[PDB]
Write a protein that binds this ligand. Structure first.
Ligand SMILES: Nc1ncnc2c1ncn2[C@@H]1O[C@H](COP(=O)(O)OP(=O)(O)OP(O)(O)=S)[C@@H](O)[C@H]1O
Ligand SMILES: Nc1ncnc2c1ncn2[C@@H]1O[C@H](COP(=O)(O)OP(=O)(O)OP(O)(O)=S)[C@@H](O)[C@H]1O
Ligand SMILES: [Mg+2]
Ligand SMILES: [Mg+2]
Lengths: 186, 375, 113, 370, 546
DNA sequence: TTCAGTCAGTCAGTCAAGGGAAAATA
DNA sequence: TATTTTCCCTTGACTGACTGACTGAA
């Protein structure tokens, strides 16, 4: 495993051909924010990994805003951890009850704005329907913004008509060929 | 009043004897649903004017409630509040409370009904009630009412066997005489007897329950008087009324007897005279194929998709909407996953729907399920 | 020596055999039916139905009148209450596993006399 | 007369003490002698009386106590916890204000089911060691009372055993029946007492009475059943029927031994009978294997369409309701459709019950036979 | 920075909204107009939902009135029950419907806090005390006698399918025994087929209850009649956008939320892409924006293809077109066969698709109609005319009044001629008139791909034909990224697959890194929902089969 | 066209791991 | 309310007996 991780001297065949698509889809950042501010949320579905695109998006756009990133690909994450991060550190306060408290807090004040970045939403740790219900109730609020990505072939089965009614989903065909070097744990 | 009950009544009255006499400690009565275990004993103990305390086992789901209700009713009959926690304390308080003059040389009776729950309350409670006359030693008799025979109340260790008693099975004559008594004063007794006769001829085959039968008669009476009110038939037209009323009762047998139609709607009526469907059909056809007797079997999503594509002779793109629509049904209980090995990788589903619903659904979109269901 | 022998065989010996000897007639027939069914099968557990059928056959052999199921259930309940068998007859009735609480040789030695 | 009725009601129902004892001479003599030893002297002993239920275990102690100081009676059903037992002991001993004595332990076996058998262990210890004279006697129905106890409590348990079996023959049962239904010499009206004794004498040798006695002797020698029989028979005696007759004993014997399952089946209806016949057929074809509602319904449909008349064309909901009703009386226990049901009856019972069914048609009978 | 052995690392609006240097000020006017329009839309939608819920609660209140009419010797009286994220507010409204009208005592119960009868009764009595020790039904009866010294009690079981069966059975049994002394009424909340009731409550228990059942396309038809069929709202859509929205609504899921969402996405895209969206507003605001327009706006107006072919005239056309279409729908729905269509949706679709003059097929039935049908249709048309004032068609109303007042074949022929002249006279396709593209939007692929995207189709396209987005003539009938090579070679034991992959990658060209590329391809394939290792071979899995 | 011998292709009996909800304990 | 253990029921490969199509008569 370590030997494979060390060896990364390979070079892609079509370099500029892949490079131009990066800017081709980076041109959509302003449209992304235009859609996202008005009561929608954005999902990425494509072959290549979008982590490069997410990194470029956060560098270019997510500077003067309050943003929190979930590395859902980590084999040790659960919704309790993200709730703890939201309440303890993002919020100055010092799981269903916690969800109710957070919903009530953001209902109390409209002056707080958070950008929720989800690198992976379809990982094995977040495929539960109750966890998706929690996340949907979180993102249903008008003061939380959601950028997500899916890679599983059988991903859309996870949520139903009510859950997909919670998420004001908007789709974006972004078919890069980036390798899953970081995501693959081997 | 009690009708067609003179054997067990006289047996019970002989059993009681005199107030200063002693009787059995435990008598176990059993019978069928409407056999009369409740009306007979209540009317008897009201007529005799004896100290009896009536207790329902369903209401007293807790031992404390049972004992405290018994004690409070007994004290109220004798005449602030008595609270006990165990059976021993209840026995002590009973020995303390029965020493009243009016409860000195009389037998005090503890009528229980719906006793089927007593076996599911505690282990030692039933033997405690069985041997009450020994422990209290105060001229105490306890009755048992049930629908299960005594064979199923027996504990492993054995106890004081009550005297077993059976209330009799009813008959056509007894049932009619019970029914033909509470006649409406606005018409003839012969009319009521004939109505009960035709009602029994229609329904006695399956629905022997006197309560259900009388409820059906009460519901069905108003339709029967319409022929004589309108004047098309006379009070002596037995065949005419039979022909007029028979299909109505036959249909009420299908509808009202299962209570699919609420009684209010019944009386009001008589007074007033897409891709989800194909997914479900594919699921059903895949479930019932490799008897309908042994039940359906789970099937994977691959075969469901293949069947769905094969049936539909049109370009159905496997979008995400159809994927979410498939799982939007399992929340309606029309499907059930099994195994829970994975949530996304090959979810096997079992289709828990009846055949008639499938046939109606197919009729909705003009497709035939039968031709694909035999092999 | 007689006093000591009486004390030792009255305070140490098992009383199962003489309890079986003093049992009633129908109880003896039930024991015989169970023993015959076990000889036919060879298992240490049997349902109530096979034992009941064997008991009906043995009653017909003995000339005894036809016994009802409730009477047999009462006899079995009495036998269980003294732990001569092992059974859970409270809820299931016709499908009760019945096990000998003592060795078969002791039962035969009690029933031979 | 009222007086004799009251006397017999007190004799049988309450099981009050009586002077006549039956086949317990040695056992009662030993028990009363030991009680006298423990009373007149400071020695302490422990005894268990083991017997089948209804064999008059209580009588031995209740009479030997009269043969003879504070007595404590403990029943396993009233006091279920050690705290309750302690409360009762303190209250009965009249030492509740402060905080030889005889201990009587009814339902002794249940005391072996406690968490630590603390009460039994302490009683055994104080009996074996404490200088205060304490006598403990327990009542037992299980024949394995020696194996429900812990090793140490068994070590301190003195192995004093009394066995109450019904070791008496049929002629002795005849003598017992003759004596038990006899008025004493303390009755006010003496000529009627002598005539009553003459009548019971005559009833003793009546062979139809001997039929009842032989039948209930084969059923159960336990005297509780015989007392119940005598009470039920005596219930049919008034002024208009001044003396008991053999026909009364026959009636009581028949009323004491009627089967409940046949009666319940007699209480059923037509559809239940048809479903039971179909159930018997399915059980016959599928030897000792379960089934469900669909196979039974298909069998019933086959019978009604082919062999039976065109009448009785019932739908699925009514048959489902009938199946629910049969499941309600616990005649059918699961191991709602497609559920592995089973039957709780025997074939010959169904046949006999149908034999007594009043209005059974002929085609249904033929289907049952076929 | 974002990579470590832990899974949670934390690091104006119009400025985001507008990125082009074309016009910022017109952009910020467009955004405000769009926001106002959408606020009006949401307000009217909320009004519609409130009206519908009040309509339902009226029927429920009347049911409860008729039920308690019975409570006003028992003679077999039963327990009155009524079967009925957003649900949380729904029943909440019901509370205000019931507390202000029927009783002052209404409680709600949650299946989460009713595991046994004890907790159920404790919570019930606690709620009863708030609405003002081993409690029982006798405690409830004594409390009711103490407080009332007639009004019944209403209990809301908002998730009946989640309760315990034993608790329900025991509660119903104990409650039925005290109707004479303690009134009880139940409202069940059901979001599934009601047949489930018969699978929880046995018929023996169920015999104690008198059940009533109380409650999609009609909603969408009504909202679309009050959204697009009304002339007041300025913006509209073309044929294909409406067709896609309908063909997803009545095919994929009967949900109106995504329809409204598509409406607002279309509005946002139309107001974003087109600068001349500034042009269209309410007529006074429209004209005042017309008066002051930049030179580039006049350039855009000058280049409109519909203008190259060539507002108030278009608006009066719409206000007469919609009334004439309403009359046509009244005509069509009168027929028993319903040839043209069932609902107003199909009428508008077939009127907008093309000049209608099956049209003669419907006229064939029209030729053979009875007199009473004509009378009823004429009365309906007259009431439609009276419904709307400020009519430009008063003379036609007078003519049809003369037609009706005269009340064989010739008269029916004349009125048929009148209606046919009407439908020829007014209805037309909208794009025939110029300057339509200002108000209209049509980029069907954008909306269609955005709202109902296909992941599997896109994945297959990427893994089979890379040339579809890599324009280098990589495929016209091997030379492809190894991802595609492996995926195509799949359609498979690992040793043979690896040997074939190595020989293919060498044909396309110490080489140990080919093994590394093979491992990477296998791992990335495993991450996707494609493969799972098996034991029959080194690995043999074919989950796709497509 | 159905009933006797052959064989090849078929089919059910049989020996193991492991998931998991009931059971037990604090 | 949280945590740890147990055998019953599901999946699956190994193994040995079985029987449908073929041929020939009557
Ligand atoms: N033997 C009877 N004689 C007269 N009326 C009877 C008789 N049995 C039942 N009834 C009537 O039927 C009603 C209902 O029957 P019940 O007396 O309740 O039967 P039950 O044996 O008590 O069964 P349960 O426990 O009530 S379901 C009574 O209130 C009477 O009006
Ligand atoms: N040896 C005996 N002498 C006289 N009467 C006896 C004798 N054995 C039994 N009986 C009678 O048996 C009747 C019933 O005995 P019970 O006292 O009910 O049984 P028990 O001793 O209480 O046993 P349990 O297990 O505690 S219920 C009494 O009324 C006695 O008259
Ligand atoms: Mg009753
Ligand atoms: Mg006793």
């Amino acid at each position: 495993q370590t030997l494979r991780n060390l060896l990364s001297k390979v070079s892609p065949s079509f370099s500029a051909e892949l490079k131009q698509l990066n800017q081709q889809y980076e041109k959509l950042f302003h449209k992304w924010m235009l859609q996202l501010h008005l009561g929608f949320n954005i999902v990425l579905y494509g072959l290549g990994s979008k982590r490069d695109l997410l990194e470029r998006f956060r560098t270019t756009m997510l500077q003067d805003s309050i943003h929190v990133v979930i590395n859902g690909f980590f084999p040790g994450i659960s919704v309790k951890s993200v709730l703890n991060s939201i309440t303890e550190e993002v919020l100055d306060h010092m799981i269903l009850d916690q969800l109710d408290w957070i919903v009530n807090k953001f209902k109390e004040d409209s002056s707080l704005e958070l950008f929720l970045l989800i690198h992976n939403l379809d990982s094995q740790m977040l495929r539960g329907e109750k966890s998706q219900q929690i996340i949907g109730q979180l993102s249903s609020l008008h003061n939380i913004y959601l950028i997500a990505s899916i890679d599983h072939l059988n991903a859309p089965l996870m949520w139903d008509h009510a859950k997909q009614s919670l998420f004001n989903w908007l789709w974006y065909e972004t078919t890069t060929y980036s390798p899953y070097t970081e995501e693959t744990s081997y | 009043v009690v009708l067609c009950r003179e054997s067990q009544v006289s047996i019970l009255q002989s059993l009681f004897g005199e107030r200063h006499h002693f009787s059995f400690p435990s008598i176990f009565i059993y019978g069928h649903t409407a056999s009369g275990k409740t009306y007979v004993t209540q009317t008897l103990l009201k007529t005799l004017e004896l100290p009896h305390v009536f207790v329902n086992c369903v209401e007293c789901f807790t031992l404390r409630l049972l004992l405290e209700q018994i004690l409070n009713k007994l004290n109220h009959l004798s005449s602030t509040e008595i609270t006990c926690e165990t059976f021993n304390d209840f026995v002590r308080l009973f020995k303390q409370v029965t020493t009243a003059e009016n409860l000195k040389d009389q037998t005090v009776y503890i009528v229980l009904d719906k006793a089927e729950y007593l076996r599911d309350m505690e282990a030692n409670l039933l033997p405690g009630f069985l041997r009450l006359q020994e422990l209290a030693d105060r001229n105490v008799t306890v009755l048992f009412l049930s629908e299960i025979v005594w064979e199923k109340f027996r504990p492993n260790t054995g106890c004081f066997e009550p005297f077993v008693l059976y209330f009799p099975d009813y008959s056509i004559g007894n049932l009619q005489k019970i029914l033909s008594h509470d006649h409406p004063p606005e018409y003839s007794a012969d009319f009521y007897a004939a109505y009960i006769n035709i009602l029994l001829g229609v329904f006695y085959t399956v629905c022997r329950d006197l309560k259900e039968l009388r409820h059906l008669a009460v519901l069905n009476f108003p339709k029967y008087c319409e022929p004589v009110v309108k004047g098309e038939a006379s009070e002596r037209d037995t065949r005419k009324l039979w022909r007029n009323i028979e299909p109505h009762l036959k249909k009420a047998m299908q509808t009202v007897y299962l209570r699919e139609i609420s009684s209010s709607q019944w009386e009001k009526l008589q007074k007033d005279d897409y891709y989800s469907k194909f997914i479900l059909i594919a699921a059903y056809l895949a479930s019932y194929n490799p008897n309908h007797l042994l039940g359906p079997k789970p099937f994977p999503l691959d075969r469901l998709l293949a069947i769905l594509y094969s049936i539909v002779d049109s370009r159905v793109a496997p979008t995400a909407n159809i994927f979410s629509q498939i799982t939007s049904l399992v929340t309606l209980q029309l499907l059930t996953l099994v195994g829970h090995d994975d949530q996304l990788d090959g979810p096997k589903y079992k289709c828990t729907v009846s055949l008639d619903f499938i046939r109606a659904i197919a009729r909705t979109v003009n497709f035939d399920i039968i031709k694909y269901l035999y092999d | 020596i007689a006093h000591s022998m009486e004390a030792v065989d009255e305070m140490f010996s098992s009383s199962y055999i003489t309890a079986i000897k003093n049992s009633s007639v129908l109880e003896q027939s039930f024991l015989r039916a169970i023993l015959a069914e076990f000889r036919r099968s060879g298992l240490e557990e049997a349902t109530f139905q096979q034992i009941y059928s064997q008991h009906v056959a043995l009653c017909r052999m003995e000339g005894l009148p036809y016994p009802t199921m409730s009477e047999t259930m009462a006899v079995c309940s009495h036998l269980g209450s003294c732990r001569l068998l092992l059974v859970e007859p409270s809820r299931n009735d016709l499908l009760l596993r019945v096990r000998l609480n003592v060795s078969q040789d002791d039962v035969l030695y009690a029933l031979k006399d | 007369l009222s007086q004799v009725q009251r006397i017999l009601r007190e004799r049988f129902c309450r099981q009050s003490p009586h002077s006549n004892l039956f086949g317990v001479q040695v056992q009662y003599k030993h028990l009363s002698e030991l009680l006298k030893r423990t009373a007149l002297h400071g020695e302490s002993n422990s005894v268990l009386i083991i017997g089948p239920r209804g064999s008059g275990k209580t009588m031995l102690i209740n009479h030997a106590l009269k043969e003879l100081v504070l007595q404590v009676h403990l029943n396993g059903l009233l006091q279920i916890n050690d705290k309750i037992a302690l409360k009762e002991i303190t209250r009965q001993l009249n030492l509740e204000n402060v905080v030889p004595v005889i201990f009587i332990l009814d339902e002794f076996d249940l005391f072996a089911h406690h968490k630590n058998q603390t009460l039994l262990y302490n009683l055994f210890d104080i009996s074996q060691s404490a200088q205060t004279p304490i006598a403990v006697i327990g009542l037992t129905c299980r024949l394995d009372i020696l194996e429900l106890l812990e090793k140490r409590v068994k070590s301190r348990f003195s192995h004093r055993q009394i066995h109450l079996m019904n070791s008496f023959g049929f002629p002795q049962y005849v003598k017992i029946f003759k004596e038990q239904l006899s008025l004493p010499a303390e009755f006010p009206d003496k000529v009627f007492a002598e005539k009553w004794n003459e009548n019971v004498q005559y009833l003793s040798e009546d062979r139809s009475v001997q039929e009842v006695l032989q039948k209930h002797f084969n059923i159960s020698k336990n005297l509780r059943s015989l007392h119940m029989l005598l009470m039920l028979a005596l219930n049919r005696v008034t002024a208009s029927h001044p003396f008991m007759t053999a026909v009364d004993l026959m009636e009581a014997s028949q009323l004491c031994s009627m089967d409940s399952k046949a009666n319940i089946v007699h209480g059923l209806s037509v559809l239940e009978i048809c479903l039971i016949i179909a159930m018997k057929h399915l059980n016959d074809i599928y030897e000792e294997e379960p089934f469900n509602f669909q196979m039974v319904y298909n069998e019933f449909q086959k019978f009604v369409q082919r062999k039976a008349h065109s009448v009785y064309n019932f739908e699925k909901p009514v048959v489902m309701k009938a199946f629910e009703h049969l499941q309600q009386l616990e005649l059918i226990k699961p191991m709602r459709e497609y559920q592995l049901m089973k039957l709780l009856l025997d074939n010959t019972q169904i046949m006999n019950a149908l034999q007594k069914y009043p209005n059974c048609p002929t085609d249904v009978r033929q289907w049952a036979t076929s | 920075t974002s990579s470590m052995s832990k899974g949670c690392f934390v690091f104006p609006i119009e400025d985001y909204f507008n990125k082009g240097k074309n016009e910022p000020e017109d952009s910020k006017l467009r955004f405000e107009t769009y926001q106002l329009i959408w606020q009006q839309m949401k307000s009217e939608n909320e009004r519609l939902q409130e009206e519908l819920n009040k309509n339902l609660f009226d029927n429920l209140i009347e049911f409860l009135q008729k039920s308690h009419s019975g409570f006003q010797q028992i003679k077999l009286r039963e327990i009155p029950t009524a079967a009925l994220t957003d649900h949380d507010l729904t029943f909440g409204s019901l509370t205000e419907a019931l507390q202000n009208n029927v009783t002052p005592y209404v409680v709600s119960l949650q299946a989460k806090d009713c595991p046994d009868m004890k907790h159920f009764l404790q919570k019930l009595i606690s709620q009863l005390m708030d609405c003002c020790t081993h409690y029982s039904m006798d405690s409830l009866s004594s409390w009711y006698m103490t407080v009332t010294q007639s009004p019944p009690v209403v209990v809301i079981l908002k998730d009946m399918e989640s309760f315990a069966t034993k608790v329900l059975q025991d509660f119903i049994i104990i409650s039925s025994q005290h109707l004479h002394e303690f009134p009880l009424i139940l409202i069940f909340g059901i979001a599934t087929s009601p047949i489930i009731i018969h699978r929880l409550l046995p018929h023996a228990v169920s015999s104690l209850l008198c059940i009533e059942l109380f409650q999609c396309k009609e909603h969408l038809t009504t909202v679309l009649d009050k959204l697009l069929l009304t002339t007041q709202f300025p913006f509209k859509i073309n044929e294909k956008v409406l067709q896609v929205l309908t063909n997803i609504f009545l095919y994929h899921d009967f949900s109106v939320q995504n329809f409204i969402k598509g409406l607002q996405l279309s509005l946002l895209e139309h107001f974003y892409s087109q600068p001349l969206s500034v042009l269209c507003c309410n007529l006074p605001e429209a004209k005042r924006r017309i008066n002051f327009l930049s030179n580039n706006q006049c350039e855009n107006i000058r280049r409109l293809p519909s203008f190259r072919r060539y507002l108030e005239n278009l608006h009066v056309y719409h206000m007469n077109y919609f009334l004439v279409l309403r009359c046509l729908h009244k005509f069509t729905s009168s027929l028993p066969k319903y040839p043209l269509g069932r609902q107003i949706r199909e009428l508008y679709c077939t009127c907008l698709e093309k000049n209608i003059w099956e049209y003669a097929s419907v006229l064939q039935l029209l030729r053979m109609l009875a007199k009473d049908e004509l009378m009823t249709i004429l009365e309906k048309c007259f009431k439609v005319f009276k419904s709307y004032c400020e009519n430009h068609l008063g003379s036609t109303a007078k003519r049809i009044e003369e037609f009706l007042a005269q009340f064989f074949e010739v008269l029916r022929e004349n009125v048929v001629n009148f209606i046919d002249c009407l439908v020829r006279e007014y209805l037309l396709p909208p794009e025939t008139q110029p300057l339509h593209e200002v108000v209209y939007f049509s980029a069907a692929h954008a909306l269609r791909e955005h709202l109902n995207a296909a992941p599997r189709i896109a994945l297959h396209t990427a893994l089979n034909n890379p040339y579809y987005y890599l324009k280098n003539e990589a495929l016209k009938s091997n030379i492809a990224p190894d991802i595609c090579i492996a995926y195509k070679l799949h359609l498979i034991n690992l040793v043979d697959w690896s040997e074939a992959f190595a020989t293919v990658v060498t044909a396309a060209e110490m080489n140990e890194i080919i093994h590394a590329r093979f491992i990477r391809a296998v791992s990335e394939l495993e991450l996707l929902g494609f493969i799972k290792p098996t034991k029959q071979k080194t690995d043999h899995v074919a989950r796709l089969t497509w």
